Amino acid sequence: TNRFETTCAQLRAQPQKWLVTGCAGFIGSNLLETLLGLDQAVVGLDNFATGHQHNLDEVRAAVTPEQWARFTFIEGDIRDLAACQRAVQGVDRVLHQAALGSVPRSLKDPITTNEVNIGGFLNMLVAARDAQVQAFVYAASSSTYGDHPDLPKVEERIGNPLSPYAVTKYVNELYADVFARSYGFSSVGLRYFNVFGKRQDPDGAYAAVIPKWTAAMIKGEDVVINGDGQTSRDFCFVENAVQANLLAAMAAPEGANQVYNVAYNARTTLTELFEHLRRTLAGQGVSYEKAPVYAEFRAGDVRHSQADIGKAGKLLGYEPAYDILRGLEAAMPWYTQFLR
Amino acid sequence: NRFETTCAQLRAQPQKWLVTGCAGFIGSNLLETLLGLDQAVVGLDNFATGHQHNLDEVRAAVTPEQWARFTFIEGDIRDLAACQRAVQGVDRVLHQAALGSVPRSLKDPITTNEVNIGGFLNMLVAARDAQVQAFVYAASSSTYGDHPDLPKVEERIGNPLSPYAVTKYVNELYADVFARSYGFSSVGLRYFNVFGKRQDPDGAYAAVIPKWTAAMIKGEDVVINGDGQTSRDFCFVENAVQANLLAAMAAPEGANQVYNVAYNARTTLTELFEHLRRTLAGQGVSYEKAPVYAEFRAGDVRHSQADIGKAGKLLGYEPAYDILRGLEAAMPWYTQFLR
């Protein structure tokens, strides 16, 4: 058995009480479903800024009534410290996902992104420290590599942030390290690489590339590739991220106070991604006969991203089970049902 | 000297300035210098750590004609509407409003983060929208963190060691990001242990020089946190004043830069105690007690010395005050202030 299988059996036999912030969002709601499916007690915190009530309802429909009875939901804002303290009380493990993604969003409104991602994160870090939680895993970002060119991306070699959003996610790591130094508070940051899967919002001005193209192709609208299309990414199926969160939360002190890449260590260009979506969608009775529209590059885009996940494998036992193709096969049916 | 050229140019061609934290230590010294150059100045301060008596002292030092060119706004940089009001019609911004004291940030990281990152970002956006000609902001030598190399060069830094150091580093990160994304240039000044008149001695978080000076004037005990070999590059406030004005009037080939502002010198804590006792003795103030050596203070860097070559080449920074000359000029303020 891999470490994830052992961890799931240990949690089921020895339940912890968890907190998932951003539980009404994409990654948060996937963590919530998995944890409740392991018979855990879970507290949730979300203000519905970008998450949806219907994500919570889907989790409710998927878990048993016994498991849903162990879920306490708090509609609240992490910018409000009283909300964070209320959410973390009596909690053993914190999985912090609440934030405002979308580098483009941060460029339009840097102030709001700073308030939520830095101010809100700091409120959660202080609340967890005071409540003496056993683990604090927070969502970091692959944007922390910035303009550093080296590929694959290794955790100890980073570059200059290139957007206000990248600043906030880098600062989460800086405050987490400082809290370890000054107060002895341990934490794990997970630098996600382009996570995708069910319940990633396809609507909105700031939708990710996979959900955005999927909705357009289902609707037969134009799909635009920003650049020449060879821009590559390490798309990470959400189930891989779920595995990383639970392993990080249950890790020993060697695996704590660390930052880990969370990806598949693979390369997929934007042209290849379009082809993958076209074939997977064809398996769901979805025709898309139009070609991609190649347009100008998007300001601030790194051209190539691939992650070295050796650190997560060695220290956490991280063995992702889904490549991009298997994740797309599982995720595409969610979008056909949701967008029908 | 570049600084003399700058002051003459300002006198003939007055600009409108904004100084946030104008009621504080460095801010009030900048205010006195700018008004002494016949500049129009806007001020923004919430009196969180500054004092009205610093503003009144500035008024007593400048002519009534110069003081008439000063508009003061009691306001908070955490309130974006206040920043927008403050930067209106302004050509040069000298942003000093913040919460210093590494010790304060360890006790209350949230408030320090709110002012130093959130407040700084409010000022940076407001200045960007108002299209100011210059934006010079106070950075800190704490950004070097645990980096061992001495002297400190701008391109070599280490990991922050306190919540306060995080906030000052984030100021540089946002300034660099704003240059990339919006084309807004700015200058960060990494101060090294600035001292001089109107640095508050009456505080739980008072800097070492004002605290030891007040204790020695009053005949109280003086405590050294550690072995006394801890060294610093103490920078007289007038050197920092010169750096702000040179940075504010620099061309773009001197903007979007971060500069060390210090003297390139070493002074241990025991030597500093010797200097304070000697300077006060020159003003008829006796202090015959020995220093009390205690444990180290959490998270304090042991040695800090700055390479100021970058500021000299790009800004013409020629600091005029070493530590001893600055102490001689500043001590009379403290004897007068306490009495």
Ligand SMILES: NC(=O)c1ccc[n+]([C@@H]2O[C@H](COP(=O)([O-])OP(=O)(O)OC[C@H]3O[C@@H](n4cnc5c(N)ncnc54)[C@H](O)[C@@H]3O)[C@@H](O)[C@H]2O)c1
């Ligand atoms: N591919 C990715 O989506 C990706 C990549 C890198 C990092 N991340 C990080 O992972 C985390 C989750 O991202 P996601 O893709 O699930 O985004 P999402 O928008 O789907 O979910 C974020 C959730 O946080 C909530 N939230 C936002 N501000 C809040 C506030 N002030 N108080 C309380 N709740 C608040 C939203 O309502 C939403 O439910 C974020 O921290 C994000 O930066 C995601």
Ligand SMILES: NC(=O)c1ccc[n+]([C@@H]2O[C@H](COP(=O)([O-])OP(=O)(O)OC[C@H]3O[C@@H](n4cnc5c(N)ncnc54)[C@H](O)[C@@H]3O)[C@@H](O)[C@H]2O)c1
């Ligand atoms: N040795 C030093 O003095 C030193 C060293 C490195 C950096 N700095 C930086 O220099 C700047 C000035 O520091 P100082 O030594 O004069 O400290 P100070 O406390 O004397 O001055 C700061 C001023 O800012 C004001 N202020 C604080 N929060 C505010 C807010 N939210 N809105 C408006 N005004 C606010 C205070 O009232 C005060 O007048 C700070 O940014 C500090 O970090 C100082």
Ligand SMILES: CC(=O)N[C@H]1[C@@H](OP(=O)(O)OP(=O)(O)OC[C@H]2O[C@@H](n3ccc(=O)[nH]c3=O)[C@H](O)[C@@H]2O)O[C@H](CO)[C@H](O)[C@@H]1O
């Ligand atoms: C640094 C980072 O992780 N930023 C966010 C973003 O990462 P990214 O900006 O890496 O994700 P994205 O899907 O916005 O962009 C990925 C790639 O697809 C390209 N592209 C996108 C849209 C489109 O219509 N056509 C096209 O070609 C885009 O230019 C880039 O090359 O993705 C998610 C949704 O934004 C999350 O919010 C992430 O936190």
Ligand SMILES: CC(=O)N[C@H]1[C@@H](OP(=O)(O)OP(=O)(O)OC[C@H]2O[C@@H](n3ccc(=O)[nH]c3=O)[C@H](O)[C@@H]2O)O[C@H](CO)[C@H](O)[C@@H]1O
């Ligand atoms: C300069 C720097 O890198 N960081 C910040 C910090 O400087 P510092 O923390 O260096 O300022 P400070 O003068 O309080 O500390 C300098 C040294 O003096 C020691 N000490 C202090 C007090 C005392 O009673 N006895 C004693 O021995 C202290 O332990 C340290 O070793 O504080 C400043 C506020 O003034 C600013 O916020 C600076 O940005």
Ligand SMILES: [Cl-]
């Ligand atoms: Cl709020």
Ligand SMILES: [Cl-]
């Ligand atoms: Cl105070």
Ligand SMILES: [Cl-]
């Ligand atoms: Cl903030």
